[PDB]
Amino acid sequence: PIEADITSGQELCTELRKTIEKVHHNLEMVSSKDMERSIKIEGILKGLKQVEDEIVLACDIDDIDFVSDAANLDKNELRFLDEGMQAALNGEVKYRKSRMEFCKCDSETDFAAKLYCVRQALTNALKDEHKRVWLAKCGRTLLADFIRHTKQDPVKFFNAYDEMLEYVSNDRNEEQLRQDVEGRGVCETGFYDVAIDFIILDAFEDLKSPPSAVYSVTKNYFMSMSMKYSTLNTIIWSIIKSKRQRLKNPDGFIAKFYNISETVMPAITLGFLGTDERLGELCQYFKEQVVQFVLDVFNTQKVCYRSLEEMSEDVWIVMRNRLEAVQTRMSNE
Amino acid sequence: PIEADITSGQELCTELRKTIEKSKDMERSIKIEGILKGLKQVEDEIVLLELRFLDEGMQAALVKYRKSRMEFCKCDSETDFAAKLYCVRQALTNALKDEHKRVWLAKCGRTLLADFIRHTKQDPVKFFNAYDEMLEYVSNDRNEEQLRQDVEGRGVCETGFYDVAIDFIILDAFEDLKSPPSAVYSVTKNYFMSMSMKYSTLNTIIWSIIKSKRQRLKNPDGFIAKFYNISETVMPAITLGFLGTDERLGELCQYFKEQVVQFVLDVFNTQRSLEEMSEDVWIVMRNRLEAVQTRMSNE
Ligand SMILES: CCCCCCCCCCCCCCCC(=O)OC[C@H](COP(=O)(O)OCCN)OC(=O)CCCCCCCCCCCCCCC
Ligand SMILES: CCCCCCCCCCCCCCCC(=O)OC[C@H](COP(=O)(O)OCCN)OC(=O)CCCCCCCCCCCCCCC
């Protein structure tokens, strides 16, 4: 492909030189400006010929990102995958986004199966209360360390994070949590469906297509970090205030998360859409490992697709370690 | 002719430039980057290288314009558009041959927008400099060609007052304020922010957007850049007015919008001659602008 690109480019430059040559020969035939044009075109032709010979012969910010571990990838028989496969063929896998290509799967059916399996493994591993407690504490210190890195105070985030932790731990709020996400088109209420697909992955998607206004403000090389952040918080606060008006329940799941968004979104936007390579690289490492986690659990060659307990162990290992590497990347500065 | 030929080369270089944009591996990247560097250099070089008056406009199209506002002025047909418009163009430019009327209208528009920036408890000093800088620009006939190439580049047909000021700037402004980005609208209509908080946030956004737009201009001292200077200064006050929570400023904003629209409606109303309608269009214009500056002055 690249060879084809340069091949066509070589043809373009050759024709371009031919065009300039004709003009120069012509201009040569016929005032100071007339001679002036011939002089400039002459120089233009010289440079284009040199270039010809040479040919003949939201902005992502990269950051160190390479975490890997042992994987069980020696068998082709994966009853668990087949169970999801059969269920997928059965017609019991209703997705909300179908990120099959994002998960690098073969077809909707392979994604549909692997999803049904990943749903099971994640919720199964999160049956352990210690794992839920550890994961919450890790996400807290991770987002806190970042909000710290923007020279901000994460108290309000702690309040929203803790307020949200009490809601999900209290099972009496389960129906409302469903009524919310189901009203926003989410099908099941597992961790992946509500946390990964609905919140984070959509957030990484929303950060790739920001309004022309907000990004024009973030990428202003004449604004300090402080004024960038101050402007962003006002916008985010006013939008979440504007969205909170439309909610059917002011203490429901969407409102409880909007409280977290009001606090952590300003710092995250400033990271992804700012001009600081330090803050931007932190965001990319965070994004790259979260995406790599979703990529790893959707690979029969990285996790164990044979049983619930094997996959539950594997998906928890990948989740636990990816999040730690990010929290470390954040804690050390 | 030869100009078209060099224009053809410009297109070819532009396409090649984009195609080029699309240890040995690193070495090749450096080499192609150098090729792209040089290609852009020459690219830039190449770039540098009964109804009497109606009858006049009637069948005159047999009238190049930008937007068909046939409904905007509620006349019979598109062709009735071209006549009434061709007709309005002449009257405005003819009446604007008078230096006294040019001076009065400029003086009126100046104090009007200043009262606007004042209503936001702001200082219109920067606007005054931007307003004057362009007034010197349009008054100097040596900038006439550049003023064409700019507006000509944005699809404007004629260089009269109506085509550049009303059709191109004002009426476009009334439209863009009706479809604001989801972000800017939520901030202005935030009933929990003070007047100061809204204006300051709006100015930061507007200043940064115009910086992002100003980067794309072909002339940093051309007509469009001179207008962006006016926009950078008065637009924050105007946006906060139309989309804010103050009913005093909002009502003032609405009165201004209603007065300009009815003026455009009146000049496109038959119930004529070159001098007779030139007299008529100026009186309505003079009267509409005065009524607005007055209601602005008292508040
Ligand atoms: C970009 C970063 C964003 C960070 C902020 C937003 C995301 C985190 C905060 C919101 C958490 C929602 C929890 C409920 C979800 C749900 O409903 O999932 C249900 C899950 C799955 O088990 P189950 O309930 O199906 O088991 C039923 C058995 N019969 O179990 C829960 O109860 C939730 C478990 C997680 C609790 C939160 C832990 C801390 C936050 C996550 C850490 C990582 C942050 C994101 C990294 C990309
Ligand atoms: C939404 C509000 C926006 C406000 C800020 C932007 C608009 C106002 C400021 C910029 C003025 C541009 C002038 C060029 C226009 C043009 O092209 O008109 C061309 C006219 C007509 O003659 P001619 O040039 O065609 O003759 C060509 C012969 N060869 O003559 C001019 O030279 C312009 C005369 C007017 C000068 C400006 C008057 C003061 C500003 C307006 C105040 C009231 C508000 C507007 C009400 C409709």
Residue numbers in the entry:
A (entry chain A): 109 to 138, 142 to 168, 220 to 495
B (entry chain B): 109 to 130, 143 to 169, 239 to 251, 255 to 463, 468 to 495
Could you share sentences copied from the article?
Here, we characterize mitoguardin-2 (MIGA2), a mitochondrial protein present across most tissue types in higher eukaryotes, as a lipid transfer protein. It comprises an N-terminal transmembrane segment, which anchors it in the outer mitochondrial membrane, followed by a coiled-coil embedded in a largely unstructured linker, and a folded module at its C-terminus. MIGA2 localizes to contact sites between mitochondria and the ER or mitochondria and lipid droplets. We show that a channel in the C-terminal domain of MIGA2, lined by hydrophobic residues, enables this domain to solubilize lipids and to transfer them between membranes in vitro, and that this ability is essential for MIGA2 functions in vivo, including in both mitochondrial and LD biology.
We crystallized CeMIGAlong (residues 106–496), including the coiled-coil segment in the linker region as well as the C-terminal domain, and determined its structure at 3.3 Å resolution. We used an AlphaFold2-generated model of CeMIGA2C as a search model for phasing by molecular replacement, finding two dimers comprising four such modules in each asymmetric unit. The domains in the MIGA2C dimer are related by a 180° rotation. Maps additionally showed density for two four-helix bundles, each corresponding to a dimer of the coiled-coils from the linker region. The all-helical C-terminal domain of MIGA2 is globular, measuring ∼65 × 35 × 35 Å, and features an L-shaped channel (∼895 Å3 in volume as calculated in CASTp [Tian et al., 2018]). The channel is lined with hydrophobic residues and so is suitable for solubilizing lipids. Difference density reminiscent of a glycerophospholipid at the other end of the channel was modeled as such. The bound lipid co-purified with the protein from the Escherichia coli expression host and presumably corresponds to a mixture of glycerophospholipids present in this bacterium (primarily phosphatidylethanolamine [PE] and phosphatidylglycerol [PG]). There was no density for the lipid headgroup, as might be expected if lipids are bound non-specifically. R177 is strictly conserved across species and appears to be important for lipid binding (see analysis in “Its lipid transfer ability is essential for MIGA2 function in vivo”); likely through interaction with the glycerol backbone or headgroup of lipid ligands.
